[PDB]
Amino acid sequence: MKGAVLITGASRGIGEATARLLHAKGYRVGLMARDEKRLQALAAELEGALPLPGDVREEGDWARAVAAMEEAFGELSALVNNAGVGVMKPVHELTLEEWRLVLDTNLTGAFLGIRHAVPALLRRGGGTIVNVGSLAGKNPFKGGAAYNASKFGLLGLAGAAMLDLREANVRVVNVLPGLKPEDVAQAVLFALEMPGHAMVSEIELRP
């Protein structure tokens, strides 16, 4: 009875470390990821976890994932918006398709996560939404136009969302890594157990 937590980009990096940590801590986690091959292996490692291969950009996949969490665990206590991809090229060399891939996955994906998760959290009397910040701090860098745009956008989305859901006992917390994936994973764990009283809205880790 630790709480059902949905995690995007769970097949690798921070997502995987987070998945592994929460599962080893008694959390019943849902693993959302695009890479089916990796997810399949992780689904057998974390027995009990709910493997949910899909596309964070698709609103349909989000409906199915949240519905699946409630059907398998009876509820959704938290969402960890981690999913994040990049395409490092000079701003004027990026194509619309590349721009969209990053923005739709990193930013639109988080928005959809929130939209589809809130209704499920409300039915549980509340919950937590954790967003993973940029893995390169909050300073612009060459070739990062799309990436920075998505990560900065994410903060704006999270800031407004925090104010919106605050009275419905839904805490929006940002975990901003900008070392090791196991580190960020620890930060996410803290955000899920420590707060609760809806006060901490941002945890930052040293570069």
> Rounded to whole angstroms, how far apart are CA atoms 131 and 108?
13
The nearer residue to Co ion, 38 or 89, going by C-beta atoms, is 38
The tally of CA atoms less than 13 A away on the side-chain side of residue 172 is 25
What does 165 bind: Co ion, its own copies, none (CB cut-off 5 to 8 Å by kind)? its own copies
Other CB atoms within 10 A of residue 82 CB:
31
Reported as type and span, the H/E element at residue 50 is strand 50-53
The nearer residue to its own copies, 29 or 158, going by C-beta atoms, is 158
SS3 30: strand
SS3 percent helix, strand, coil of the chain, rounded to 5, is 50, 20, 30
Binder to its own copies among 82, 108, 131, 174 (CB under 8 A)?
Answer: 108
By the rule CB under 5 A, 108 interacts with Co ion: no
What does 85 bind: its own copies, Co ion, none (CB cut-off 5 to 8 Å by kind)? none
Which residue is catalytic, options 27, 73, 111, 147? 147
Q: Which residues does the annotation mark as catalytic?
A: 147
Contact footprint for its own copies (CB under 8 A): 59, 90-92, 94, 96, 99-100, 103, 107-108, 111-112, 114-115, 118-119, 136-137, 139-165
